[PDB]
Write a protein that binds this ligand. Sequence first.
Ligand SMILES: NC(=O)c1ccc[n+]([C@@H]2O[C@@H](COP(=O)([O-])OP(=O)(O)OC[C@H]3O[C@@H](n4cnc5c(N)ncnc54)[C@H](O)[C@@H]3O)[C@@H](O)[C@H]2O)c1
Length: 223
Amino acid sequence: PLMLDTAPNAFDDQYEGCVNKMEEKAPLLLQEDFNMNAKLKVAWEEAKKRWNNIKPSRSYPKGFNDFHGTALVAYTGSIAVDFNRAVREFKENPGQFHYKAFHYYLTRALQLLSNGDCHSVYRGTKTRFHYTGAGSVRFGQFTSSSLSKKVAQSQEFFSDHGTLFIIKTCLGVYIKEFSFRPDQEIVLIPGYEVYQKVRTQGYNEIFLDSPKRKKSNYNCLYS
Ligand SMILES: NC(=O)c1ccc[n+]([C@@H]2O[C@@H](COP(=O)([O-])OP(=O)(O)OC[C@H]3O[C@@H](n4cnc5c(N)ncnc54)[C@H](O)[C@@H]3O)[C@@H](O)[C@H]2O)c1
């Protein structure tokens, strides 16, 4: 079982007040990441190709560049697990965080593609999640979900040993074209979104409601 709390140790940078400085610094940062993170480098190079193919079929937000696009395609890829881990366990040893640039671009990508829109999404896991009664909840790491409860419950993501999250999010982003699917109706949720209403039902169902945007514990850490 894993704990569900306010994710006090997760690198949750929202980059308030440093977007301009980051867009200028992140490119160098990305090189540093690659030098210390072979897996990321591979994931990114492949993601880059894919993005070249996807980019022409549609128009993106002003400022939304190849870094944002490549970062997002990559997240829907296999690099997601390690990245999520590194973020979730940031405070546990911030010295070995080699996703400084990745984190920023992915965070920025979602912020740029975002609107006021809220969604009813579902998320399945094969690991039991226990809410430790903090009063509110944040995933900490970025977290994928699906508009379809069917997907979330498929043998792909869920099992009796796990948990089914029924989430009401307003910072989540529908990123169909970016995914490798595109049939899982993925909605990407930033780890810093806060759910003011938490409710466990049965042994493996958790409802998260009253989403709200709050300040993060970290801000412009690498700016
Ligand atoms: N999960 C879903 O319901 C769902 C739905 C649609 C698409 N996807 C897709 O999922 C991808 C994989 O994302 P994911 O859903 O597996 O997230 P993820 O891989 O983090 O989830 C798997 C698990 O990863 C590690 N983990 C996650 N949170 C943890 C925590 N708080 N503490 C300790 N370990 C933790 C644990 O093993 C956790 O059980 C891509 O394929 C994406 O398109 C997932």
